[model samples]
Target: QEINLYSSRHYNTDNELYAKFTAETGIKVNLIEGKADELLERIKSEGANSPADVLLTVDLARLWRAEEDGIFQPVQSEILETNVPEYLRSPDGMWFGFTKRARVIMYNKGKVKPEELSTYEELADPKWKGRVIIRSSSNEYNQSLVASLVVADGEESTLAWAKGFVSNFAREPQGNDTAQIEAVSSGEADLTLANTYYMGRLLESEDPAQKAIAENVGVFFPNQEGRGTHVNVSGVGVVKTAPNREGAVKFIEFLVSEPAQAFLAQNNYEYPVLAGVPLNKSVASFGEFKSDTTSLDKLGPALAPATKIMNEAGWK
Candidate 1:
């Protein structure tokens, strides 16, 4: 049986992993790739006729979105439950996390000392005025992070934090995570909030400019003393109307297997959800920090409120 998959991940390395799965399992993976939200809408529109067997997204919020849409069915798999951590997977087994990317601070090492930084909330401090940079509010990462904060710090506090963060902007939010790194290296901003995996891309890039930017940028795990660093996952769920349910479960199981998990770490620079996979030399350099263990179950619902807060707070 073949499993039709909808994925938001666009990395070439992931393609090779899929091919490997086909070779070993004799089950073909039919893939459709696009922006996470777009793919979700397509599945919702197709309803019972949807050919999608599995939906993959880069953030917990989107996974939760899929859950909320009733597009995914609960999966029962001991392999998945064991491979993925409790915090990263859906409690009811509707979705499972394959990789983790920490939402952390990236600063120019020469300009900022480690001690000067504290938590995600502290980014809004008066000390960082005109020294902050982040991606646009439209980005899923920022939305999800803000949504998680809504649950942790209360909506009122999160809104105030967004407004304070907006006031400290070295420039208006724009560009991908990589560009945020560029801004830090160019001294246009002292630091930026971004995912950990993007820095891995620039460091591993062949381009001299990318390499230079990677060298200057340093990662800081925020909120260590409090709730710990915010982390999101590249996750998957079996489609509610899956045509090949067995195959979908099998493919998902393959992904969390040692071989595929290692491939994710080495090729895509993601932290494998499965324990015991060795980290790449580049990612290992960041060391380890306490992960924010807040339940992601709230993020999907919190997104609307988070967006409302960002807009009202002028976090353009």
Candidate 2:
């Protein structure tokens, strides 16, 4: 028997992990890879006959979107509830975050010091104006971060904060997380925001130029003195129209097992969701900071508001 999987994660390492799952369970995994949005649309068009049993995607907003579209059915699994942190899983068990990624500040080591940095709000100060670089407002990662801020600080305060934060832009917001990191290293900006895994990948790169770029900057987890750093996740959920519900549930349970958790943590350079799994060495080297504990499920509702704030504040 086979369970169809619609996954947006393009990592070959994840495929290897799936192969291991197959070896043990004998239930073959039929994979379909595409952009998360495209896959979601495909599933919707396929309707009642959709073969997709599991959907894996990154970012809470997307998982929430899928649920809102009525594509996911709630799963009740003792293993998932036990392995995933309370805040990382949907209350109804519709989705579960498997890995954690922190959107953090990276500073040019030659220009900025660790003590000089304190919180995300301080980056808006006039003292740091024209010194920060981040990706555009269209990015879900930034939207999720802004969503966390809105929940913690309220809309009026967040609107003001967004304007102030945008005024400090090093350049018109452009590029991917890795590009922001590269810009900071090249001194295009003194500071930038990027996911922790991007830094880990650069650090572990085979290319000397990439490794050099990683060496030029230092990672800083913002808001440590407040609610802790804002973190997002890559998560999975069961499709409502699954043809192989039992196999789908079994595969999801396997993802949280120790072997799978360890493989994901090390190969993906992302923090493991299962407690006690070791961090990728490069990621661990940056040290640790408290992660924001606000239920990620809340991010779904805040996405639109956050985008509105970003647009009004000219984050683009």
lDDT of 1 by residue, 1-316 (tens): 7999999987878789899899989998889999999999999998798899999988999888788878889998999988888878888899999998998999998899999998889999999999999999988999999998998898999999999999999998888888999999999999999888888878887799898999998999998888788888999999989999999999899999999999889878889988899987788889989987764767889999999999998888
Error of 1 at 265 (Å): 0.9
lDDT of 1: 0.90
* Reference-based TM-score, model 2: 0.94
lDDT tens digits, residues 1-316, model 2? 8999999886758889899899989999999998788899999999998999999987878899998998999999999999988888888888888888999999999999989998877888998899998999988789989999888887888999899999999899888999999999999999988999999989988899999999999999998878899999988999999999999998889988888889888887898999889998999999978998764657888888899999999999
Q: Lowest-lDDT window of 10 residues in candidate 2?
A: 292-301
Candidate with top TM-score is 1
lDDT accuracy of residue 184 in candidate 2: 96
Model 2 has a clash total of 0
Question: TM-score of model 1 relative to the true fold?
Answer: 0.96
In order of listing, the candidates' clash counts read: 0, 0
List ranges where model 2 is wrong by over 4 Å. none
